[PDB]
Amino acid sequence: ELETGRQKARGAATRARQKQRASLETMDKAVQRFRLQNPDLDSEALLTLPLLQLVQKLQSGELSPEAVFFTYLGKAWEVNKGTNCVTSYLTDCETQLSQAPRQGLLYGVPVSLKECFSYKGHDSTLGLSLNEGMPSESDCVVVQVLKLQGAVPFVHTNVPQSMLSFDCSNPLFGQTMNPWKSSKSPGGSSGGEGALIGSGGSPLGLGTDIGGSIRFPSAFCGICGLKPTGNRLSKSGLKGCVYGQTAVQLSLGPMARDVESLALCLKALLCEHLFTLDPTVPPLPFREEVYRSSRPLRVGYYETDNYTMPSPAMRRALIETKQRLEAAGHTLIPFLPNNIPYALEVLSAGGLFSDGGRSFLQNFKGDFVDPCLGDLILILRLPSWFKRLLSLLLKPLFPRLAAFLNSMRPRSAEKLWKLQHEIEMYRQSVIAQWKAMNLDVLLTPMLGPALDLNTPGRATGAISYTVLYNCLDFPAGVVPVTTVTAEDDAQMELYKGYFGDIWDIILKKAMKNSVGLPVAVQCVALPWQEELCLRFMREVEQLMTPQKQ
Amino acid sequence: TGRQKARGAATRARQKQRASLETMDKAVQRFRLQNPDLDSEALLTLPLLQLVQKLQSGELSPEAVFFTYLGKAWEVNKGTNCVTSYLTDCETQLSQAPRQGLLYGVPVSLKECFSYKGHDSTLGLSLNEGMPSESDCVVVQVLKLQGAVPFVHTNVPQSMLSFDCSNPLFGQTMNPWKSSKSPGGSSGGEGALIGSGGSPLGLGTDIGGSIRFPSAFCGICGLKPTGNRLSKSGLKGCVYGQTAVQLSLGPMARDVESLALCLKALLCEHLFTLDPTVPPLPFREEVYRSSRPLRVGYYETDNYTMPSPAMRRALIETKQRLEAAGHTLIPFLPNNIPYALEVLSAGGLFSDGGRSFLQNFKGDFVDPCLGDLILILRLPSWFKRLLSLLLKPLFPRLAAFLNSMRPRSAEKLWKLQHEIEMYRQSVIAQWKAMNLDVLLTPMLGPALDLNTPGRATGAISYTVLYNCLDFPAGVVPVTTVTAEDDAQMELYKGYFGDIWDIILKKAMKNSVGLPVAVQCVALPWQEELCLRFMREVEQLMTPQKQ
Numbered sequence A: 001e002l003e004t005g006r007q008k009a010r011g012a013a014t015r016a017r018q019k020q021r022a023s024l025e026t027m028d029k030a031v032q033r034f035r036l037q038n039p040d041l042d043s044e045a046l047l048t049l050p051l052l053q054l055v056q057k058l059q060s061g062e063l064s065p066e067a068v069f070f071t072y073l074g075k076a077w078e079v080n081k082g083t084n085c086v087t088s089y090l091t092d093c094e095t096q097l098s099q100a101p102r103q104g105l106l107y108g109v110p111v112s113l114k115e116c117f118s119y120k121g122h123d124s125t126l127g128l129s130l131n132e133g134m135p136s137e138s139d140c141v142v143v144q145v146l147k148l149q150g151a152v153p154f155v156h157t158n159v160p161q162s163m164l165s166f167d168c169s170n171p172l173f174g175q176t177m178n179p180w181k182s183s184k185s186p187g188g189s190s191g192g193e194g195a196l197i198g199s200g201g202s203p204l205g206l207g208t209d210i211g212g213s214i215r216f217p218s219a220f221c222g223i224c225g226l227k228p229t230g231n232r233l234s235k236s237g238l239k240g241c242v243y244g245q246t247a248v249q250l251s252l253g254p255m256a257r258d259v260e261s262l263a264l265c266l267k268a269l270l271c272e273h274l275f276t277l278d279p280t281v282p283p284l285p286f287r288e289e290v291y292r293s294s295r296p297l298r299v300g301y302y303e304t305d306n307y308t309m310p311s312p313a314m315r316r317a318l319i320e321t322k323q324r325l326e327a328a329g330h331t332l333i334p335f336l337p338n339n340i341p342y343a344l345e346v347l348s349a350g351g352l353f354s355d356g357g358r359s360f361l362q363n364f365k366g367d368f369v370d371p372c373l374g375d376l377i378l379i380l381r382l383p384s385w386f387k388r389l390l391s392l393l394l395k396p397l398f399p400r401l402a403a404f405l406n407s408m409r410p411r412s413a414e415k416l417w418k419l420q421h422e423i424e425m426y427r428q429s430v431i432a433q434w435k436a437m438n439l440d441v442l443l444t445p446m447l448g449p450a451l452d453l454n455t456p457g458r459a460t461g462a463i464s465y466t467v468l469y470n471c472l473d474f475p476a477g478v479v480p481v482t483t484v485t486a487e488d489d490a491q492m493e494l495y496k497g498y499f500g501d502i503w504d505i506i507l508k509k510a511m512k513n514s515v516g517l518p519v520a521v522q523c524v525a526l527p528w529q530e531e532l533c534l535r536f537m538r539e540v541e542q543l544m545t546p547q548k549q
Numbered sequence B: 001t002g003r004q005k006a007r008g009a010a011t012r013a014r015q016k017q018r019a020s021l022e023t024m025d026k027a028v029q030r031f032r033l034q035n036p037d038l039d040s041e042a043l044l045t046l047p048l049l050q051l052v053q054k055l056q057s058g059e060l061s062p063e064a065v066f067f068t069y070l071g072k073a074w075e076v077n078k079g080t081n082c083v084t085s086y087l088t089d090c091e092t093q094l095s096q097a098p099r100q101g102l103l104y105g106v107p108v109s110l111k112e113c114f115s116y117k118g119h120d121s122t123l124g125l126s127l128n129e130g131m132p133s134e135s136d137c138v139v140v141q142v143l144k145l146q147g148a149v150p151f152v153h154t155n156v157p158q159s160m161l162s163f164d165c166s167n168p169l170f171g172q173t174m175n176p177w178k179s180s181k182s183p184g185g186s187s188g189g190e191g192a193l194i195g196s197g198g199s200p201l202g203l204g205t206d207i208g209g210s211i212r213f214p215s216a217f218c219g220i221c222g223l224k225p226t227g228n229r230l231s232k233s234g235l236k237g238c239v240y241g242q243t244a245v246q247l248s249l250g251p252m253a254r255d256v257e258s259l260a261l262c263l264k265a266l267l268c269e270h271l272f273t274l275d276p277t278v279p280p281l282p283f284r285e286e287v288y289r290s291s292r293p294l295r296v297g298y299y300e301t302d303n304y305t306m307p308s309p310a311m312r313r314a315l316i317e318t319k320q321r322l323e324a325a326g327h328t329l330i331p332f333l334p335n336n337i338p339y340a341l342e343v344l345s346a347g348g349l350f351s352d353g354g355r356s357f358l359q360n361f362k363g364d365f366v367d368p369c370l371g372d373l374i375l376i377l378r379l380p381s382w383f384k385r386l387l388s389l390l391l392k393p394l395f396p397r398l399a400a401f402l403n404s405m406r407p408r409s410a411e412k413l414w415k416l417q418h419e420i421e422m423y424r425q426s427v428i429a430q431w432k433a434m435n436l437d438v439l440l441t442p443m444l445g446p447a448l449d450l451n452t453p454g455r456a457t458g459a460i461s462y463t464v465l466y467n468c469l470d471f472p473a474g475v476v477p478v479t480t481v482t483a484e485d486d487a488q489m490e491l492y493k494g495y496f497g498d499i500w501d502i503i504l505k506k507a508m509k510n511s512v513g514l515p516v517a518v519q520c521v522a523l524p525w526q527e528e529l530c531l532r533f534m535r536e537v538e539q540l541m542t543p544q545k546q
């Protein structure tokens, strides 16, 4: 195909940065007007309110919906200056403010949206030039449901280009930065959400997760996030770059400052409105009694997946929460899902790139490739025979690299059927393993602390802790439990990795210089058991960070 | 070319079936002689709901119900050839059936593909003979936990890719109403058994109509739920990992209430625990029992398969009764039916050109009831393409199907899967624009002559559309063919006049007295509402059933 250059892509970038620029000015102007009319308002008391209390005061009338809206708008504008997490102000949101149903479970709550959640009259670019100047004709289903519940969606937040990354930079809106440390990634692909919520600029946000994109930015930015079972919530109207891939399910879910916020959001979403607007979603209501249960749990756990070497902080965080759960009366059982390398290298990678990345590469014709994607585009572009040849050469010394490369080759429909059956069988395998140990839930390390900017794209092995559960399609959630100590960070000098390949080398350097950064643990339950997963997340939060409850 | 394995497999299967039937015969004669006072006729004519209440109260023993049905199953098999296997350990499960189970003491027949410990699930294929299952499948386990007693495996057409019912192992199943007619398929044995009174309840599978065809043809009720409403764990199939067109399993029975009871009993903690991949949606009684007037979408023809006069009459009469009962009947036709059938359904079912499917037929006989399926799939891709755009001017149905049965890349499958999602969304948008609750449809009928379904592929149009869409769909008998209806088949031409229309015309003839059904459809996950509508149709068209 003929080389078309980058002139369209450059035009899209100047247009996009203007829309972002204009958005933030409009935000600033709106909040200046409001503050002038309300010098009495205690900004800092309002912003430090846990969502549950914020909701309660909104419902009673103690706080006006305008007071909380403009106070958050101001904070979001402020934190954006150091993070670059906001791409667009949702301009019509002041009308929703007035129209917000007063009996709605999220009445008056400002909500941030990952850019891929289509909002009427706005682009969902995904950092891709071909999506610039293509405004959505309508709000997506979950946005419709949020509005019906009285919430006020107010911003679109940044994503890495195309979203196939756990960093957060694109050629259109640039690079999002961790609020804790500007040299660090906020994670991704829900990076903007993580940065925004993590710095206090949003009480609740929505992201998506197909390889860890809710959990990475939650862990990196010290906030809570939940990835439900793929089809617990509606994907209708969600902007993506590849359609029709059903092997590894996409999921959407809440991100917030406490697990109670995540549970409220699920409860609000799981309503008649959602089940009517999207009939393909099973009408499973939020089961309050499961979430609120105080029964002792049988908790499976592992300190390492034997694939990605945990940092000293990751390992400590896991052991500490394990010990605190034991002290609180729960029974902790060593458990590691079988055949993890297979789940990652052949099932996950093969399921995500069954067509050799051809559909994915279509989005990049005429576009810049953001450095945070590393060599993904270069690799996927290689002919199938060459991918195979390099894989063969790489295999004896670097088995991880060879297996991922082989699984990123195109295949027939016949072989996709075979792969899809293998995913179904693997899912039943881990379920049988789980049931044979009689587990309720599973405790796992969560990748942390935050990697340096532009390193996630060069440390692919590190997705092992998260993508395992996209493959299995188990609800998985993340909660901050500790911070990196000087001792934790110094021990990175001794970090080797299990393979010593390029991915291990990058990761050793990428996790250094992290003293003070948040570190998370991951909570997992069986498919459709979101309430139980949240019950477990609530427990972890209470034991590790009791002030949040 | 060599057929020695296949002949050996058939010899062995036939011996096992003969021995199963002999074991049944001996057990029945023994029970009858020890209990001569039992009114067996009264037992067999009891509606399932009344049967289970007497079982729960102790009025009828599990033994009485079991051996009485076992005897009837043995008798009806003589004329139908619907039973392949006696599930021998059932006599011990009987004595241990959980007392408070919702199906306590109920004998249940099982389509052969439902794995049962110690028995083959052959699918009429040599390669599966003498390979007994080592676990009960999930739904079987759940049935037993609810106190039910699975007692037989019932016949299927070879490989299950057919709405006829013959294989080279156990041979041909016949319609109980008329021996020259097909019982339907692929759950054909279930249709014949239940349709003749030999079982009060059975389980079938459905990916193209395999529950609905035999229910309609044999004059019973059947429901095809949403694909993942129930566990497919332990289900035997000849192709795995195809997800574009959803496979579904569900009950078949004499009345709608029986389907509801079975669904209620399956939708329990035991199921949701044994298969966590199934969304734990309890049976919503309030929805099933609703007496609210319905907005009922309807069509009398899909403009693809010309309905028989009996089909059309059945549809119009139930439409009229629903109108009189106070429901609002709204003309409604899913958009782009030919496209959904010819490219989406055909393309989804055969995305690999039938390669996976064909592996099951190496060294095996090809049953006549499959027609030209195997011969056609074996054709090279370039030749399928060649024949297609040669047939397209003359016979566009045959051309479209042939082109869609070619192998493709993972990339093209993604594209097809995406188009299926979009299509589903487009019908849902249509449904909502008319604000429907429910959809009324014709159901292919009356029963086709033996060995003709394999040559009337176009006739799957009424059924396969709702597998593609993955909407719950059920059938209920509403009428029988009159001689007036039957005579009118002489004026039937079809819309296309291709070989499928020609065969269907002849195949639906000589059907006086045969049952004719209607189809009820709801949105995904709305099985209870589908059953609510089915219950309404049953009440209005056949009130003595309630």
Ligand SMILES: Cc1c([C@H]2CCCN(c3nccc(-c4cc5ccccc5s4)n3)C2)c2cccnc2n1CC#N
Pocket: A163, A164, A165, A166, A188, A189, A210, A211, A212, A213, A216, A349, A352, A373, A374, A375, A376, A379, A401, A402, A404, A405, A457, A458, A460, A463
């Ligand atoms: C993180 C993430 C992924 C990853 C999956 C695995 C492949 N991958 C990636 N990225 C960058 C570089 C490489 C490779 C480099 C390399 C070098 C030598 C041999 C083989 C290879 S593979 N791979 C992206 C992904 C896929 C689909 C959708 N969302 C995705 N996310 C969002 C999150 N979380």
Ligand SMILES: Cc1c([C@H]2CCCN(c3nccc(-c4cc5ccccc5s4)n3)C2)c2cccnc2n1CC#N
Pocket: B160, B161, B162, B163, B185, B186, B207, B208, B209, B210, B213, B346, B349, B370, B371, B372, B373, B376, B398, B399, B401, B402, B454, B455, B457, B460
């Ligand atoms: C019924 C049924 C199917 C059918 C789908 C459509 C294809 N098909 C079939 N059968 C026999 C002959 C032919 C053709 C003949 C012919 C002649 C000229 C040009 C094109 C063609 S295609 N096609 C079988 C099916 C598929 C998968 C699984 N379960 C299936 N069932 C169970 C039911 N109900």
